[PDB]
């Protein structure tokens, strides 16, 4: 009955562990010895976008690398024009408890959700010059931690009820429900070709989901606590996960195991955001100390610091052309470094 | 600035003006966090507080040029540790306990543990606690034949339907507070009480007054 199933599960877990240990030839910290270091990158805050009156909980760049949405706890979702700092729209929300925000790849829609369990999708490019809710995707049980557009008609969401979902915006209901996690789901990130996506949970494990089939492919677990952020390598075969034990990690999708670990003895605070660079050589990471860090993704040695915030940084984004880095924080100021 | 960039800047300044007006409109109002326990019966509680001229839900109460917002986190499977830092600027929590649940399995120790957990978060340091103890008449009618002295260990008082059952439980719920800094605005609400709104107004006024004493150097 249950005993046979438990025994088979444990035996096969040992089997897969020994398997992923068999194909482990050498570390990455050795293959990247004959590489010139990048030195020290110092970046200065070129912009400072102000106008929010509370914490800023999310942020996302437009694919033209110029506009960016930002969602705050004062009931506002503002669409800044980062080049000239203007505001383009200031959408008022129905529930002011938001914890996520997204911008469509085409640039037509935006999305936001929070403690109200509902992911609202606002349509920007409409007639009547207004900005009205197109759909209100409901069906989750806990809060929504992240939500990422795929097309103008599909969206993946991840909620605190231990599930992810793939909504078809047109009809309005889940077309696929990704289950298998144990704790909450705090963050999510799509592959550059939008055929897979990784999701980080509070049970110290990240998973790789296949959008087409709808079932888990691989289960990465090397952390010691919850995972607050995740982001893919620009190549598409690696991703970085920020945890609350103050350590980022870089796993490989084909080796099925972890490659590198980024941690210093001075940093002890949790990690709120993770992002790569256009090349993927660097690695921006936000911390609770109110200062960013720029790790060297190939040698693991820290290579700079971006300290310009008074309170914890909660969102961090890199433009699609790599030309800037926006960081938001709980003092209502998000700045644009370069 | 071309002929259109000036209009874009004007639109941005109007957007920012509306942001400022809405922000000053939303600074006047106060926000309270209602955190009831399991089967503590806060449905009838909010029903009563709303009828007598009063996911996540917000109840707005207009009281004498003040606007309270009772924020009830109704349905959440989120273990309370990940979203609670949203409510770090609330004026006061509103813990809602039940008195009659010293027997159900027990149930009361769960309420004590929840209170102790919520009260020690580093987010609630500038916000007072406002206990309510619903279902008092159920305690008065139930405390007979109850032998409360076996369920809770010490209970120095009399084994009868004494007022100890009501004050002993308040002492148990107060002794879980980190002392000398925070004051707990207790209360003994029944199923058919009416002064809940007045007591909440009084406790919020006292909280603001003590915060202004601490902030205005007047101490």
């Amino acid at each position, epitope marked *: 009955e249950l005993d046979q199933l438990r025994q088979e599960a444990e035996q096969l877990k040992n089997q897969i562990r020994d398997a992923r240990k068999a194909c482990a030839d050498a570390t990455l910290s050795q293959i990247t010895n004959n590489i010139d270091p990048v030195g020290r990158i110092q970046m200065r805050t070129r912009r400072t976008l102000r106008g929010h009156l509370a914490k800023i909980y999310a942020m996302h760049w437009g694919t033209d690398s*110029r*506009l960016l949405v930002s969602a705050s706890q004062d009931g506002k979702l503002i669409i800044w*024009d980062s080049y000239t700092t*203007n505001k*383009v*729209h200031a959408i008022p929300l129905r529930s002011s408890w938001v914890m996520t925000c997204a911008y469509a790849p085409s*640039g037509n829609y935006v999305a936001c959700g929070g403690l109200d369990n509902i992911c609202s999708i606002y349509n920007l490019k409409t*007639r*009547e*010059g*207004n900005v009205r809710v197109s759909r209100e995707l409901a069906g989750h049980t806990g809060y929504l931690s992240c939500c990422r557009f795929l097309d103008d008609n599909q969206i993946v969401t991840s909620s605190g009820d231990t599930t992810c979902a793939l909504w078809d915006i047109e009809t309005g209901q889940q077309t696929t429900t990704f289950t298998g996690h144990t704790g909450d789901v705090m963050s999510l990130s799509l592959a550059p070709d939008t055929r897979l996506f990784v999701s980080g949970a509070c049970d110290a494990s990240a998973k790789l989901w296949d959008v087409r089939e709808g079932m888990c492919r691989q289960t990465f677990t090397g952390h010691e606590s919850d995972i607050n952020a995740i982001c893919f390598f620009p190549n598409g075969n690696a991703f970085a996960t920020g945890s609350d034990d103050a350590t980022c990690r870089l796993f490989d999708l084909r080796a099925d195991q972890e490659l590198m670990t980024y941690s210093h003895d001075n940093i002890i605070c949790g990690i709120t955001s993770v992002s790569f660079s256009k090349s993927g050589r660097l690695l921006l990471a936000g911390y609770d100390d109110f200062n960013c860090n720029v790790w060297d993704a190939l040698k693991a040695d820290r290579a700079g610091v971006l300290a310009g915030h008074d309170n914890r940084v909660s969102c961090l984004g890199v433009t699609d052309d790599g030309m800037a880095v926006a960081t938001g924080s709980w003092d209502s100021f998000l700045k644009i470094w370069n | 600035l*071309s*002929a*259109e*960039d*000036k*209009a*874009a800047v*004007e*639109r941005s300044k*109007m957007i920012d003006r509306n942001l400022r007006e809405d922000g000053e409109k939303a600074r006047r109002e106060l926000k309270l966090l209602l955190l009831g326990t399991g089967e503590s019966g806060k449905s009838t509680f909010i029903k009563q507080m709303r009828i007598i001229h009063g996911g996540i839900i917000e109840y707005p109460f207009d009281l004498q040029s003040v606007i309270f917002r009772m924020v009830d986190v109704g349905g959440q499977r989120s273990e309370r540790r990940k979203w609670i830092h949203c409510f770090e600027n609330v004026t006061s929590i509103m813990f809602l306990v039940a008195l009659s649940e010293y027997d159900q399995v027990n149930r009361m120790e769960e309420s004590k543990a929840l209170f102790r957990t919520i009260i020690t978060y580093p987010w609630f340091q500038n916000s007072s606690v406002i206990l309510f103890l619903n279902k008092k008449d159920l305690l008065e009618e139930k405390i007979m034949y109850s032998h409360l002295v076996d369920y809770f260990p010490e209970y120095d008082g009399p084994q009868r339907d004494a007022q100890a059952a009501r004050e002993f439980i308040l002492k148990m719920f107060v002794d879980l507070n980190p002392d000398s800094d925070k004051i707990i605005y207790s209360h003994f609400t029944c199923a058919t009480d009416t002064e809940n709104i007045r007591f909440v107004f009084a406790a919020v006024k006292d909280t603001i007054l003590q915060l202004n004493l601490k902030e205005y150097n007047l101490v």
Partner: single-chain antibody
Amino acid sequence: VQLVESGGGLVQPGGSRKLSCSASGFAFSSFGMHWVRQAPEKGLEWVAYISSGSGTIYYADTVKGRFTISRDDPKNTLFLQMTSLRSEDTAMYYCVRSIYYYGSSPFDFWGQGTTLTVSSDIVMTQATSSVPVPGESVSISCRSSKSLLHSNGNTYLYWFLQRPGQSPQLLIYRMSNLASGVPDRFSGSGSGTAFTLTISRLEAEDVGVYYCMQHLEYPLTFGAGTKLEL
């Protein structure tokens, strides 16, 4: 969305009048409105401009002082008070909406107009006056006086199409982008001070007049026009 204008009629020279445009279907409070008049057998001419919130007002140099524009947001109306009308104002006054932000398309929806009867500038020249034309590709050209390309890369030149007995509509804004609801057979291109519009596979209800407007300095000069006849 819809705009309905009212006023006009026979007016004695030197009198006064008020034109009222009622807007129904859109957020009038967020749109800057224009007035674009049109003589009987001539082309379009800018008249006045009122911003959103009435915080910015402009007029044309030939109607400066004796016209007064205003807007009423609660009632959703736009008023143009005209005083001492000369005998050269017998024109049909269209009302134009326009919203300016990064990525917007001003002048998108022009309402209908009212026909009165009163009993420097970037000179733009559409040299083509009449081009004969179905199913074949046609091209129209517009020449600007000074360079319309601004330092930020945007080139402000718009193309409008007016059919016989209708109101002109936005085809292309900023010389590259196509407006919404426009068939994909239209295209626009060119370089600084020389712009072109190319049409492929002409259909019915496509003959009309093409106007090239600039939006750089706010006298907002228009073009002469190019009628496509059969």
